[PDB]
PDB file of C-alpha atoms and ligand atoms in Angstrom:
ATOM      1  CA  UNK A   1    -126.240 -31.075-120.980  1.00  0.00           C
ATOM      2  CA  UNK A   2    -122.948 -29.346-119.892  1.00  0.00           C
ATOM      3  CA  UNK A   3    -124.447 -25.364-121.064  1.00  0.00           C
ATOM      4  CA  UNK A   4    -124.507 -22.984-118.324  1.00  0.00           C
ATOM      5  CA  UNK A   5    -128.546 -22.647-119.357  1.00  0.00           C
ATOM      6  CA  UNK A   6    -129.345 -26.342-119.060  1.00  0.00           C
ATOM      7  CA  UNK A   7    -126.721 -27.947-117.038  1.00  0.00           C
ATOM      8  CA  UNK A   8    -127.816 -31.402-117.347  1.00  0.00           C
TER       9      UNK A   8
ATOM     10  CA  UNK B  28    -125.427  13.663-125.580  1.00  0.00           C
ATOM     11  CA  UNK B  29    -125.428  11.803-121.989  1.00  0.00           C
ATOM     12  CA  UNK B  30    -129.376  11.357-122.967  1.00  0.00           C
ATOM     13  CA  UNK B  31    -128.194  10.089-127.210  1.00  0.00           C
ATOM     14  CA  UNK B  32    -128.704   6.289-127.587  1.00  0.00           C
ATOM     15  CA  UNK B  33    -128.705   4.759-131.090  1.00  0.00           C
ATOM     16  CA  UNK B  34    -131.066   1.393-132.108  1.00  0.00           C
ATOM     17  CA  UNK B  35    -128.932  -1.278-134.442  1.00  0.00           C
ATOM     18  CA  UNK B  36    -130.567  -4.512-135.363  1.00  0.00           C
ATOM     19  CA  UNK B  37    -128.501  -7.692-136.951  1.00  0.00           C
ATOM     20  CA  UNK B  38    -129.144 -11.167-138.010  1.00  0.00           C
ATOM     21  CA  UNK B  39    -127.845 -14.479-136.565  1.00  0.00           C
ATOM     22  CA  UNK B  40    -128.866 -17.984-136.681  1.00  0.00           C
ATOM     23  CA  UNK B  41    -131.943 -16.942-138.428  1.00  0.00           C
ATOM     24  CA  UNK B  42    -133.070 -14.936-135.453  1.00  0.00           C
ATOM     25  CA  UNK B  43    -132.702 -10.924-134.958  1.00  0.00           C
ATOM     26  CA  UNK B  44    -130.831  -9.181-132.346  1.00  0.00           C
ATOM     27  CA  UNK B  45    -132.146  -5.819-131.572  1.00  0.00           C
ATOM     28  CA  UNK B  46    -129.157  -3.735-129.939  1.00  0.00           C
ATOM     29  CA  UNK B  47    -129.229  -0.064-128.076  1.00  0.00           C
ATOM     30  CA  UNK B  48    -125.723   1.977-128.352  1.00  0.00           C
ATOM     31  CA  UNK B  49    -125.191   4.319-125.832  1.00  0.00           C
ATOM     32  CA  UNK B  50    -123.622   6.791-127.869  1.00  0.00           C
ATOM     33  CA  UNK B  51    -120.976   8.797-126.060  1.00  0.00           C
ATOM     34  CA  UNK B  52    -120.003   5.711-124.215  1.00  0.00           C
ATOM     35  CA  UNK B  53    -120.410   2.781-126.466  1.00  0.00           C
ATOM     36  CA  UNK B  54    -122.064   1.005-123.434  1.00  0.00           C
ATOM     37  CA  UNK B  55    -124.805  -1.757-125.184  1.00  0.00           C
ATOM     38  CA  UNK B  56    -128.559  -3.292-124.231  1.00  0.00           C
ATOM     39  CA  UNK B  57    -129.721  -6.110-126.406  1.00  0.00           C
ATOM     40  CA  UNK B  58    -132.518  -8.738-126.889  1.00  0.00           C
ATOM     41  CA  UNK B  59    -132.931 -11.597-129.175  1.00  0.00           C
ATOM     42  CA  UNK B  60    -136.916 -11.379-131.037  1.00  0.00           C
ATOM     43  CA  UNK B  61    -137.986 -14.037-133.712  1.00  0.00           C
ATOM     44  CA  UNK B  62    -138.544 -10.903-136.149  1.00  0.00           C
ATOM     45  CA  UNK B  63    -138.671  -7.004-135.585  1.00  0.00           C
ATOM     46  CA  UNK B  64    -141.904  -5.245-135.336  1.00  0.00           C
ATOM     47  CA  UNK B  65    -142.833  -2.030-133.864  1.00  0.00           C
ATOM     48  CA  UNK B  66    -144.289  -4.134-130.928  1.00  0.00           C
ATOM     49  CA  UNK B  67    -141.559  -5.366-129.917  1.00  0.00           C
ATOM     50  CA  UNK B  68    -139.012  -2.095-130.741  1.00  0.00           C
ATOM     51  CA  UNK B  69    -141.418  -0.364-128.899  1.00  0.00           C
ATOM     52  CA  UNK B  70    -141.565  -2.684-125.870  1.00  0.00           C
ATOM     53  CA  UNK B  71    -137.590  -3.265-125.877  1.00  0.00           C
ATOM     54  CA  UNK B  72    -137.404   0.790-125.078  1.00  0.00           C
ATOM     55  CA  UNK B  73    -139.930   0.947-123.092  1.00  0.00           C
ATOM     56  CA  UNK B  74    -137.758  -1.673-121.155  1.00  0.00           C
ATOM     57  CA  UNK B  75    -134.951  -0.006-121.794  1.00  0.00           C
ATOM     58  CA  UNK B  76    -136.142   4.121-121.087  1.00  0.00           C
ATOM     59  CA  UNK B  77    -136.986   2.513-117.104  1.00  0.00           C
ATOM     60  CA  UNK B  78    -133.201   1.393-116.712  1.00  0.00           C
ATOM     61  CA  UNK B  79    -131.116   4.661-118.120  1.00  0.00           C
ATOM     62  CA  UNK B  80    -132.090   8.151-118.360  1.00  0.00           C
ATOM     63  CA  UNK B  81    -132.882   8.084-122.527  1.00  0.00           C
ATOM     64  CA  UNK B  82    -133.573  11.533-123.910  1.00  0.00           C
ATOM     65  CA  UNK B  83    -133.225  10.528-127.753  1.00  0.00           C
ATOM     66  CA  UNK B  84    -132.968   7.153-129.816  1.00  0.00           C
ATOM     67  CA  UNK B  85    -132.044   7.625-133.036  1.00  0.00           C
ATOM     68  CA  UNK B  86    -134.050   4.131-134.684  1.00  0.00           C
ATOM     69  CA  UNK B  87    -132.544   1.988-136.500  1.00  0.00           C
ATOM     70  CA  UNK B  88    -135.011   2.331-140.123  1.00  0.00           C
ATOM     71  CA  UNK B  89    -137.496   3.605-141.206  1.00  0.00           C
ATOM     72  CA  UNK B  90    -140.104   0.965-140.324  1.00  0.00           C
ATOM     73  CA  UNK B  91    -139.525   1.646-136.549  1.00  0.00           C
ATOM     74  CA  UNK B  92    -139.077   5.099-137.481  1.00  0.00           C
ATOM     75  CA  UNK B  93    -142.760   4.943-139.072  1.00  0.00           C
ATOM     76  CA  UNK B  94    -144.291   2.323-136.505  1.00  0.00           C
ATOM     77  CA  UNK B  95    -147.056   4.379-134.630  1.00  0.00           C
ATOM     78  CA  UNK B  96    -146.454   1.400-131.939  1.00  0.00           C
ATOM     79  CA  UNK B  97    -142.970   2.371-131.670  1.00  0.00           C
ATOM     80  CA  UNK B  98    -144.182   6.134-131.162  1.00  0.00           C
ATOM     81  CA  UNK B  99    -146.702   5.447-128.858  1.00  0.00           C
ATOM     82  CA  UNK B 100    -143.630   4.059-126.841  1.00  0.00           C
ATOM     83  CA  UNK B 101    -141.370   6.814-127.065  1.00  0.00           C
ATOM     84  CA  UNK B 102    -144.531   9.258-126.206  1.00  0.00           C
ATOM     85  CA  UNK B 103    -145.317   7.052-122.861  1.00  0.00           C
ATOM     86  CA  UNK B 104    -141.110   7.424-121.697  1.00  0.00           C
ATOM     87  CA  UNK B 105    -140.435  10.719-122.614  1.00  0.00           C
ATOM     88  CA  UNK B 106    -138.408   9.769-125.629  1.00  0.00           C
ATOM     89  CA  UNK B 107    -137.497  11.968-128.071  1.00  0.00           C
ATOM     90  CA  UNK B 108    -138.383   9.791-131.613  1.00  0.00           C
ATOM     91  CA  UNK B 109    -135.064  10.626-134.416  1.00  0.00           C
ATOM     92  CA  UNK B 110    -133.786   9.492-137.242  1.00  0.00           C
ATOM     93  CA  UNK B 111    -130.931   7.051-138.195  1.00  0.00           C
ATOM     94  CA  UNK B 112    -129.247   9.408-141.013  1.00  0.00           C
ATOM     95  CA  UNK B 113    -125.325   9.204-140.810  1.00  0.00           C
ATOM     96  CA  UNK B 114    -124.840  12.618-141.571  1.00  0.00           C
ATOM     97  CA  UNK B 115    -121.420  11.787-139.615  1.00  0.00           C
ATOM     98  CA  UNK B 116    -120.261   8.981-141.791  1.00  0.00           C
ATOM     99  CA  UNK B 117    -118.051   7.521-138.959  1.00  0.00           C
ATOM    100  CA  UNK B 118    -121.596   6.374-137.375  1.00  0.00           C
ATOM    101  CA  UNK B 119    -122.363   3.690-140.345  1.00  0.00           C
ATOM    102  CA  UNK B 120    -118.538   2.452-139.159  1.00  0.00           C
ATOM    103  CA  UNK B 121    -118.734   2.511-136.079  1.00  0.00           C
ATOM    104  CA  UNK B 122    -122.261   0.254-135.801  1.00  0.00           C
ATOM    105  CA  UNK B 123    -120.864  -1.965-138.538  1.00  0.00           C
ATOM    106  CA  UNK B 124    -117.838  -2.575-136.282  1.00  0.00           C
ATOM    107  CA  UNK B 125    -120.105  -2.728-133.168  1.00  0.00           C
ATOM    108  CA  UNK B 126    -121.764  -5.824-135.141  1.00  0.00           C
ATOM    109  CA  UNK B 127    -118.787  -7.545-136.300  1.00  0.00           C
ATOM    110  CA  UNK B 128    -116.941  -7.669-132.506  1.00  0.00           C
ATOM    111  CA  UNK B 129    -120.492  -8.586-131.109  1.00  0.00           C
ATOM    112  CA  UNK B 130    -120.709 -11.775-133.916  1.00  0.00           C
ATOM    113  CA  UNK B 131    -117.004 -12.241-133.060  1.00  0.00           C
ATOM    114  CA  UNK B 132    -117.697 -12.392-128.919  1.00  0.00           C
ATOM    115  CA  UNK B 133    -120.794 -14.620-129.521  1.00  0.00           C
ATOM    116  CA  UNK B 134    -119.342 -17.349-131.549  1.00  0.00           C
ATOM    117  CA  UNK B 135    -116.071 -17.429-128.836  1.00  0.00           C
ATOM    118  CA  UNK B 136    -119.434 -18.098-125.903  1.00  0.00           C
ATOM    119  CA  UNK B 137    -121.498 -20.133-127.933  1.00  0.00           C
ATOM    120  CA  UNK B 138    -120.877 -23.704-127.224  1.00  0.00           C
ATOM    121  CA  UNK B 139    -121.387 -22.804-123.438  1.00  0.00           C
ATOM    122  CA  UNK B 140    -125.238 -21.683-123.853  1.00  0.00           C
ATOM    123  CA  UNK B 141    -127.717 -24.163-125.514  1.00  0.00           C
ATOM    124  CA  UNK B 142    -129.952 -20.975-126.595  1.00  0.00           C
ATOM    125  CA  UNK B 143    -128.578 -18.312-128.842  1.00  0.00           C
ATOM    126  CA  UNK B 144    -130.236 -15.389-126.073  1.00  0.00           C
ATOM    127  CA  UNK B 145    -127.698 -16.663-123.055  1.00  0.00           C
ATOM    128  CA  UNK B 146    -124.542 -16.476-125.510  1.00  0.00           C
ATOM    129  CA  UNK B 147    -126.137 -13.028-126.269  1.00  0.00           C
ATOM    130  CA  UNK B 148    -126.381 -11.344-122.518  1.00  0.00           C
ATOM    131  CA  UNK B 149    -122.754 -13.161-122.183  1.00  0.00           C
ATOM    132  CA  UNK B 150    -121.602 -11.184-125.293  1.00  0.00           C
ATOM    133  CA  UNK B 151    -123.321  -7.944-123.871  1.00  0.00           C
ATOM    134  CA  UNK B 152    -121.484  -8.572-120.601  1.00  0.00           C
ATOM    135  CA  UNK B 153    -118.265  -9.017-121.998  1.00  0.00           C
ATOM    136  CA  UNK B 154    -118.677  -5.718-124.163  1.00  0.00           C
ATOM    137  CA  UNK B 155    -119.823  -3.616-121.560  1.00  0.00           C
ATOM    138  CA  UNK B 156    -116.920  -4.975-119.294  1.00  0.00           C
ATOM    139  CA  UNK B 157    -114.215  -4.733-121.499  1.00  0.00           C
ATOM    140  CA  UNK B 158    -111.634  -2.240-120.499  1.00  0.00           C
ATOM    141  CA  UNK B 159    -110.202  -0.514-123.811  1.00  0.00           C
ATOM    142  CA  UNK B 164    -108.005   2.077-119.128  1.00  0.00           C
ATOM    143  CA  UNK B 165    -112.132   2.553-118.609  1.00  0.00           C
ATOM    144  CA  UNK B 166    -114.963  -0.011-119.831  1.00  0.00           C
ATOM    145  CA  UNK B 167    -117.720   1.071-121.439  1.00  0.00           C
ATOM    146  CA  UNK B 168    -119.812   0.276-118.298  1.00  0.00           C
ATOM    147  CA  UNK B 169    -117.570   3.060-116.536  1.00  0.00           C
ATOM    148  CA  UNK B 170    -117.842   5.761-119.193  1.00  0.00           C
ATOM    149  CA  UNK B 171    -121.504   5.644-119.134  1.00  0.00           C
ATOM    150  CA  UNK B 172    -122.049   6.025-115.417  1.00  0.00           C
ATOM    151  CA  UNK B 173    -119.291   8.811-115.024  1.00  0.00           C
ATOM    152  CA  UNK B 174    -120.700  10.466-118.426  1.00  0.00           C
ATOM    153  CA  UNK B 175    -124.454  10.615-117.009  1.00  0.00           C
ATOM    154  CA  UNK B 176    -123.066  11.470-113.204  1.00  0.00           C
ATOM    155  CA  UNK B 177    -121.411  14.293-114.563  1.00  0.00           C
ATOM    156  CA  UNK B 178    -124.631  15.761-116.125  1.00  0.00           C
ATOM    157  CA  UNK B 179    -126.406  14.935-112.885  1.00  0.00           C
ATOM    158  CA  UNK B 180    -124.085  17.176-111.427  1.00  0.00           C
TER     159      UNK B 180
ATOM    160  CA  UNK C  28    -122.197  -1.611-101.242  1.00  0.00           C
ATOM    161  CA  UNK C  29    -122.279   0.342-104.609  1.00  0.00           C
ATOM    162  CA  UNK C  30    -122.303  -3.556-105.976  1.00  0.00           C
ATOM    163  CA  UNK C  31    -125.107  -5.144-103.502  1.00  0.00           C
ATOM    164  CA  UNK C  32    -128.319  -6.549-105.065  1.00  0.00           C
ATOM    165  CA  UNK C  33    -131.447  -8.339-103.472  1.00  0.00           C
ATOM    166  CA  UNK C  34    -133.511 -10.334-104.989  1.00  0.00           C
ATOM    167  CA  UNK C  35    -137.477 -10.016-104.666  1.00  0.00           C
ATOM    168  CA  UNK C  36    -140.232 -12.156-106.182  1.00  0.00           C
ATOM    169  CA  UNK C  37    -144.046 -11.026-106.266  1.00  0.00           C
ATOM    170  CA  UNK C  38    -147.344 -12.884-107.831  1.00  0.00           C
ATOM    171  CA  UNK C  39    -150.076 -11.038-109.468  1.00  0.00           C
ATOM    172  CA  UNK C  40    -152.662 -12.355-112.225  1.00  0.00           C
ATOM    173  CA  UNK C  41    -150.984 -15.817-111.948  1.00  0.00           C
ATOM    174  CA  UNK C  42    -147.878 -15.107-112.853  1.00  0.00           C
ATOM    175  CA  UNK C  43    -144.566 -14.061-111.152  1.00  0.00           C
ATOM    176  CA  UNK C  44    -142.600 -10.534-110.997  1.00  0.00           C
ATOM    177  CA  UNK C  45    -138.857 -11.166-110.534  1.00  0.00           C
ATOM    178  CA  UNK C  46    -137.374  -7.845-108.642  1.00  0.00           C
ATOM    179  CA  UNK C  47    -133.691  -6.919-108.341  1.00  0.00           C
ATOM    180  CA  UNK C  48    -133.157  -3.807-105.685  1.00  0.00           C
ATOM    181  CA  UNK C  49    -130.396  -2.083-105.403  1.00  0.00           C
ATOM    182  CA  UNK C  50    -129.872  -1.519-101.862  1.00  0.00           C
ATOM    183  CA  UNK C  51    -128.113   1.714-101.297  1.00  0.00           C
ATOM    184  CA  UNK C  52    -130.650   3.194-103.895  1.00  0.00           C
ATOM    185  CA  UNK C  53    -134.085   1.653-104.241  1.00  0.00           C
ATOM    186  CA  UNK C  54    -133.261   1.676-107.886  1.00  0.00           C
ATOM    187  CA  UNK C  55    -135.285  -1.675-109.441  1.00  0.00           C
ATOM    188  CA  UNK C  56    -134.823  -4.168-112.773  1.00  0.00           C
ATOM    189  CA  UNK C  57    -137.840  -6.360-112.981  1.00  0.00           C
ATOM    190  CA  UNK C  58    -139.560  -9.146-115.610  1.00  0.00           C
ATOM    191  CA  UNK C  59    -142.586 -11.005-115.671  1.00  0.00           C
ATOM    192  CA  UNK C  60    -142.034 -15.233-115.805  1.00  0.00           C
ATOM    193  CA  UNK C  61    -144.458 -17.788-115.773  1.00  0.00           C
ATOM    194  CA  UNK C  62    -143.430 -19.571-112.790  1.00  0.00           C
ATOM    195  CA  UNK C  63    -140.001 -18.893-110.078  1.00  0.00           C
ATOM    196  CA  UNK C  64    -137.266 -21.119-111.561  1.00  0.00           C
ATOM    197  CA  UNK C  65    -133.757 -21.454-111.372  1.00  0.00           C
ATOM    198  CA  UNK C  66    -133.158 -21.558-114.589  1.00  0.00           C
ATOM    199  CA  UNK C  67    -135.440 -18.343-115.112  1.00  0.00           C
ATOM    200  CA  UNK C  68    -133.851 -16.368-112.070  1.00  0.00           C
ATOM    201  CA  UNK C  69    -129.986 -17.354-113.301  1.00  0.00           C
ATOM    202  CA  UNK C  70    -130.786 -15.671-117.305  1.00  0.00           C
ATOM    203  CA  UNK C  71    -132.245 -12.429-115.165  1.00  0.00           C
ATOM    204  CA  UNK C  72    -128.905 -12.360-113.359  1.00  0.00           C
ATOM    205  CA  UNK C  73    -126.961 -12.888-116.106  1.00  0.00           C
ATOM    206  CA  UNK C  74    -128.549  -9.822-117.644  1.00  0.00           C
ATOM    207  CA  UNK C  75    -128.512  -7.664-114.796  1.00  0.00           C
ATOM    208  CA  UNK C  76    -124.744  -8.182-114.702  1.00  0.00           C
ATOM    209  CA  UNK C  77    -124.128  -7.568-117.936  1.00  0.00           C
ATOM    210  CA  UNK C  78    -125.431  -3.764-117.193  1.00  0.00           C
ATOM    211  CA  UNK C  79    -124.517  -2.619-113.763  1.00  0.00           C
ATOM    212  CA  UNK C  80    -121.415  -3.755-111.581  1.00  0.00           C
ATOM    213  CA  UNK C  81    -123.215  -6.417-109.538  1.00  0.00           C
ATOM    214  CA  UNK C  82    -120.841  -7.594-106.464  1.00  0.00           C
ATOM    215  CA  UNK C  83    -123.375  -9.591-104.506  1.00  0.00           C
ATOM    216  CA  UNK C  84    -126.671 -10.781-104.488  1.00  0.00           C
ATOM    217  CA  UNK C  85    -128.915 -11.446-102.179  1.00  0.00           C
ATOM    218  CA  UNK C  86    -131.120 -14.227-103.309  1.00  0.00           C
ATOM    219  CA  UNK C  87    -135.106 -14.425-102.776  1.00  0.00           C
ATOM    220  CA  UNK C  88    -135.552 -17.761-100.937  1.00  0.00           C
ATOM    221  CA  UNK C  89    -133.099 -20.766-100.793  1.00  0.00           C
ATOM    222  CA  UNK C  90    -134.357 -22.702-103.952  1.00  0.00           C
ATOM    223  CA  UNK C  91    -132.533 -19.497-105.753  1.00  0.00           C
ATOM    224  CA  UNK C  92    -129.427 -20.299-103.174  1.00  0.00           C
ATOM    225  CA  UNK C  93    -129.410 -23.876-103.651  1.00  0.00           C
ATOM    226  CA  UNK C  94    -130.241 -23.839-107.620  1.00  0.00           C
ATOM    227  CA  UNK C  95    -126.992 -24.833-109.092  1.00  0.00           C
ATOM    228  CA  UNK C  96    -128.053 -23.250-112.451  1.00  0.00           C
ATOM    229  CA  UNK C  97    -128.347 -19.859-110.803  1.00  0.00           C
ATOM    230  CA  UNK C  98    -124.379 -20.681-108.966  1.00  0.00           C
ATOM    231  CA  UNK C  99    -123.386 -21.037-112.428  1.00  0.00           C
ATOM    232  CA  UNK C 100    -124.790 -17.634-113.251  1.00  0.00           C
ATOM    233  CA  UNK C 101    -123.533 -16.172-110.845  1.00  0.00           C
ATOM    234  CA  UNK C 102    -120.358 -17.749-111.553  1.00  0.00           C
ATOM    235  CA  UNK C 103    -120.281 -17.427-114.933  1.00  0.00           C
ATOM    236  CA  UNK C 104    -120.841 -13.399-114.471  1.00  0.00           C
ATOM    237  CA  UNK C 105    -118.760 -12.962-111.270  1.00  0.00           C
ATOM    238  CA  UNK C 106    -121.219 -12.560-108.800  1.00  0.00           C
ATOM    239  CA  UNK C 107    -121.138 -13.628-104.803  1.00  0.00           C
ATOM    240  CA  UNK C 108    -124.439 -15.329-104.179  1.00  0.00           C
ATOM    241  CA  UNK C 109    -125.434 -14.646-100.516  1.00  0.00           C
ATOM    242  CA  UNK C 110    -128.789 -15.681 -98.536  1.00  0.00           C
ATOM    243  CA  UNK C 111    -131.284 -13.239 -97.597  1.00  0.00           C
ATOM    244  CA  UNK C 112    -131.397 -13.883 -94.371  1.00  0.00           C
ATOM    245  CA  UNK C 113    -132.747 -10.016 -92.679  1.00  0.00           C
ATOM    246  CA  UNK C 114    -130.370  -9.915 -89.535  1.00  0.00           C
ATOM    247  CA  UNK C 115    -131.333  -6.594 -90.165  1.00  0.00           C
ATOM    248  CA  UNK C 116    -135.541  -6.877 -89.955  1.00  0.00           C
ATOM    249  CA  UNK C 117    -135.913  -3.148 -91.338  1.00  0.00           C
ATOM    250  CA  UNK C 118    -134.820  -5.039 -94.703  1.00  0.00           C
ATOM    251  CA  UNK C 119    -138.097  -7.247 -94.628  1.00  0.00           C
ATOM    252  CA  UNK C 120    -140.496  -4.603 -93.942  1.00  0.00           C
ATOM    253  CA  UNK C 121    -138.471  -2.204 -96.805  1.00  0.00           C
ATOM    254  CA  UNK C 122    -139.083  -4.996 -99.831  1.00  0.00           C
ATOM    255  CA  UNK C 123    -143.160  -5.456 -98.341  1.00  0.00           C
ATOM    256  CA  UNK C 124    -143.382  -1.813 -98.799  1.00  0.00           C
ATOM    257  CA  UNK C 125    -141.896  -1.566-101.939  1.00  0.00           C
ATOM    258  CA  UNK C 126    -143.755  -4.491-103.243  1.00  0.00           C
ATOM    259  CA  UNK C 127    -147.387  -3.108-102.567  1.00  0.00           C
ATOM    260  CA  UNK C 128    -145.993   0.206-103.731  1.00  0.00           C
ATOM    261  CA  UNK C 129    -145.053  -1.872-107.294  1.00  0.00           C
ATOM    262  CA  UNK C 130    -148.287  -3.558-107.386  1.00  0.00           C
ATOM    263  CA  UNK C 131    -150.404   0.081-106.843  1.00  0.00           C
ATOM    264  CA  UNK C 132    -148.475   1.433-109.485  1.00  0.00           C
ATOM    265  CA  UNK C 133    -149.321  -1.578-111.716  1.00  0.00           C
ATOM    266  CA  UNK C 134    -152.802  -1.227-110.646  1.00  0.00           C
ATOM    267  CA  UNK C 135    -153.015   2.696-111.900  1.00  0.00           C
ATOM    268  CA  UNK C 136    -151.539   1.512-115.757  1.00  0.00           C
ATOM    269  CA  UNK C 137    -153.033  -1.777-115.753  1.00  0.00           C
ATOM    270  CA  UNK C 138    -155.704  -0.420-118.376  1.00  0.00           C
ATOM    271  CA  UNK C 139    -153.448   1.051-120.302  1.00  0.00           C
ATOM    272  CA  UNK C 140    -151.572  -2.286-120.957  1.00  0.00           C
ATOM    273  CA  UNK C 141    -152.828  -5.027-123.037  1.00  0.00           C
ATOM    274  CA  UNK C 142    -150.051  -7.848-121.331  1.00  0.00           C
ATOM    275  CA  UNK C 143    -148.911  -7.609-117.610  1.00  0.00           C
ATOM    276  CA  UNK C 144    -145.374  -7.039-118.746  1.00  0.00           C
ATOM    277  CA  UNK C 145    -145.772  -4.051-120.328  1.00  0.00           C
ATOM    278  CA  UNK C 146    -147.660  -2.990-117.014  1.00  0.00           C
ATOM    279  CA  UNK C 147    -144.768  -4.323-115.179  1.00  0.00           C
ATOM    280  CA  UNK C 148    -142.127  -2.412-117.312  1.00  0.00           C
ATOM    281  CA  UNK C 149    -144.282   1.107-117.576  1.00  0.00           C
ATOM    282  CA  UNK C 150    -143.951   0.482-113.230  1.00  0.00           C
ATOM    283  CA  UNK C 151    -140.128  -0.370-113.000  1.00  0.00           C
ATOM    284  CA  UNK C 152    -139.966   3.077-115.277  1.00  0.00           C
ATOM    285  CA  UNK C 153    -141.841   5.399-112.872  1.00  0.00           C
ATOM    286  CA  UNK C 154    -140.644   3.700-109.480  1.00  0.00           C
ATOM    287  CA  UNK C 155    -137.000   4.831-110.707  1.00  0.00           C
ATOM    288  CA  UNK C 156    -137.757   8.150-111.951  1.00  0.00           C
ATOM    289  CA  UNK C 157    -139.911   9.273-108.918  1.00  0.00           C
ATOM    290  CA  UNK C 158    -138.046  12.023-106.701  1.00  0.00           C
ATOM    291  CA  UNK C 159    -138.361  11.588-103.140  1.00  0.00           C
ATOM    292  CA  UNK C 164    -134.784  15.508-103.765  1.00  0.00           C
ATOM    293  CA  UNK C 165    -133.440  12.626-106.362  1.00  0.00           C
ATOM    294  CA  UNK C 166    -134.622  10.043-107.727  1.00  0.00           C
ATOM    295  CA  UNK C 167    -133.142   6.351-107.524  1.00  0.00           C
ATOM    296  CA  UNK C 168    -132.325   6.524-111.096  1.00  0.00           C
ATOM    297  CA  UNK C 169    -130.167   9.564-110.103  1.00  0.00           C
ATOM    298  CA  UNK C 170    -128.849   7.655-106.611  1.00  0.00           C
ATOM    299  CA  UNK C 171    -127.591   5.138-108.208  1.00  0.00           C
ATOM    300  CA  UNK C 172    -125.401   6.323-111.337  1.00  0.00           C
ATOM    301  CA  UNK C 173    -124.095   8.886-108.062  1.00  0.00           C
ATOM    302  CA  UNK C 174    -123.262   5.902-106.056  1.00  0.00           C
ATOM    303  CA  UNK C 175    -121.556   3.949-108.646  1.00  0.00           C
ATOM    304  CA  UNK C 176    -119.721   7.489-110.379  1.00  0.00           C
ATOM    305  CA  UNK C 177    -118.709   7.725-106.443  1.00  0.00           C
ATOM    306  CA  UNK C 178    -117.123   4.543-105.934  1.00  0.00           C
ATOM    307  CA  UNK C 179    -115.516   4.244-109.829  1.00  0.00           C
ATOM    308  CA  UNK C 180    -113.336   7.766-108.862  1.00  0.00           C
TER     309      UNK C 180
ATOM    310  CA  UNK D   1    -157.147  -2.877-129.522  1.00  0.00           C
ATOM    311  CA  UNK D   2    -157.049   0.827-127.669  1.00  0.00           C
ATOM    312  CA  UNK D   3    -153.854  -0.334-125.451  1.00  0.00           C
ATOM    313  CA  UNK D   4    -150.094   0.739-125.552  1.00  0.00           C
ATOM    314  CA  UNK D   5    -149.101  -2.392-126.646  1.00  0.00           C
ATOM    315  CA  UNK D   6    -152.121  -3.336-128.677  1.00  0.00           C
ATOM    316  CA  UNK D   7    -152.894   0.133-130.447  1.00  0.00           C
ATOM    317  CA  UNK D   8    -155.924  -1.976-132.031  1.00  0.00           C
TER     318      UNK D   8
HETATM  319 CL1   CL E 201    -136.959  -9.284-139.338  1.00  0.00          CL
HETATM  320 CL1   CL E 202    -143.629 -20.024-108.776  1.00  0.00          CL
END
């Protein structure tokens, strides 16, 4: 998704 | 006073951060916990009494202050239980303004993390790194080297 | 080498022990996790960051290395993410030791402890402040005072 | 429970 804790 | 930390606890996004002050250094530990209980005080310096060399915590009420859970903890580390009292009234400040710049540092980092405890070990980080020239990260090491010594 | 970290990862009771060494010290940060993933090991550097001046790290395996959650961690927090490759072997049979010395120690409070991470925690707590002489609680604020003067 | 972390 673009956080540092769920990229995706 | 290299052995002095201080428990604060404060609310965000319906959730409760439970913080350790160093006190001579204003280095920080923290944790975010659905609610406090003496459980998890009690496990959060047991965590914490394995990492630095804590003589005293002064707690942050008098629920963790009562907790036998939370005394049972300090008994098992070596930790000398205290009260919160400010009988320095620059202590209520000083916490109060600890909270503030903490709230401050985690709404700057928040749209990076999806969960509210990643923007709070980033706001931790950023604390303990931030030179005011020594960081707080600095003072504590030299502060509890010294006393080694 | 004040700022060098290696990774370590252990199973007991079904579940995983995630173990940061200090090199220069044998001082250890450690949490139980339900199962070795990058998105587990990158939070756990993110917080060991936050509280001691990590340089490099050596990771555990190369999922860790490849994970590109934990090279946003480490960028995020300023950290150079190595491999853990032991060119030098007395490195391998160092973290063997001092994982059956963990998992002894865990065995000897086990009882005492109602959930393995408490076990875990009361463990990390008297691996640091056992003298073997100083302690590596002591060796590495020392190291780190050392290198900050 | 007669444990640390369970005084029950
Ligand atoms: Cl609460
Ligand atoms: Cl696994």
């Amino acid at each position: 998704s673009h956080k540092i804790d769920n990229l995706d | 006073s290299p052995g002095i930390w201080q428990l604060d606890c404060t609310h965000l996004e319906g959730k409760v951060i439970l913080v350790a002050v160093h006190v001579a250094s204003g280095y920080i530990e923290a944790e975010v916990i659905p609610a406090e209980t003496g459980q998890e005080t009690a496990y959060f310096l047991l965590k914490l009494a394995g990492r630095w060399p804590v003589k005293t915590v002064h707690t942050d009420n008098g629920s963790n202050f009562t907790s036998t859970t939370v005394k049972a903890a300090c008994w098992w580390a070596g930790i000398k239980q205290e009260d919160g009292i400010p009988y320095n009234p620059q202590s209520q400040g000083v916490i109060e303004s600890m909270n503030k710049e903490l709230k401050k540092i985690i709404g700057q980092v928040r749209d990076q993390a999806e969960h509210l405890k990643t923007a709070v070990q980033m706001a931790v980080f950023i604390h303990n790194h931030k030179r005011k020239g020594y960081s707080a990260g600095e003072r504590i090491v030299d502060i509890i080297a010294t006393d080694i010594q």
